[PDB]
Amino acid sequence: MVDAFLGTWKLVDSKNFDDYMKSLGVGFATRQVASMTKPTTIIEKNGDILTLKTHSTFKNTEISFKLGVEFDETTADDRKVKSIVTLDGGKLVHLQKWDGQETTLVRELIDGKLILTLTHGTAVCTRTYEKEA
Numbered sequence: 121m122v123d124a125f126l127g128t129w130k131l132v133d134s135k136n137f138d139d140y141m142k143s144l145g146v147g148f149a150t151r152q153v154a155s156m157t158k159p160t161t162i163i164e165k166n167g168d169i170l171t172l173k174t175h176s177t178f179k180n181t182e183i184s185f186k187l188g189v190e191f192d193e194t195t196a197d198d199r200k201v202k203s204i205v206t207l208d209g210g211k212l213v214h215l216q217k218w219d220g221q222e223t224t225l226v227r228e229l230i231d232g233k234l235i236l237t238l239t240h241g242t243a244v245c246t247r248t249y250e251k252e253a
């Protein structure tokens with residue numbers, strides 16, 4: 121059910137990312153670098169285990185998880201969160217919880233592009249990724 125998300129994806133559009141980062145308390149200097157970074161996201165599957173890599177000239181992350189099973193995560197901005205990823209309406213929904221706060225990272229395929237919607241507080245960011253061959 122996750123299979124159309126798998127592969128290597130490159131950032132090609134970003135809307136409201138500074139709002140999202142600011143809502144999370146990211147400092148201005150980090151926001152400035154991040155606003156000019158174009159990550160590569162790699163999503164791979166081995167049986168029930170997904171691995172999601174995010175690579176850039178600034179911050180690099182990797183998580184592995186089973187759909188529907190909570191996992192500990194340390195985010196790129198150093199938040200220590202409780203996470204769960206699940207398919208919902210064909211979208212890959214990643215929920216992070218910490219300190220009573222939540223943020224969602226929702227991935228949906230639209231016309232072959234991967235649209236990542238990031239919500240925290242009132243901030244809603246949309247990032248578009250295109251598949252690499």
Ligand SMILES: O=C(O)C(F)(F)C(F)(F)C(F)(F)C(F)(F)C(F)(F)C(F)(F)C(F)(F)C(F)(F)F
Binds near residue numbers: 140144174179195236
């Ligand atoms: O995958 C993406 O496109 C993505 F990198 F934007 C992300 F992973 F979704 C993200 F969650 F938004 C995030 F990692 F960029 C963050 F949460 F904004 C962040 F950690 F705060 C950061 F911007 F990376 C910071 F530099 F502050 F550390």
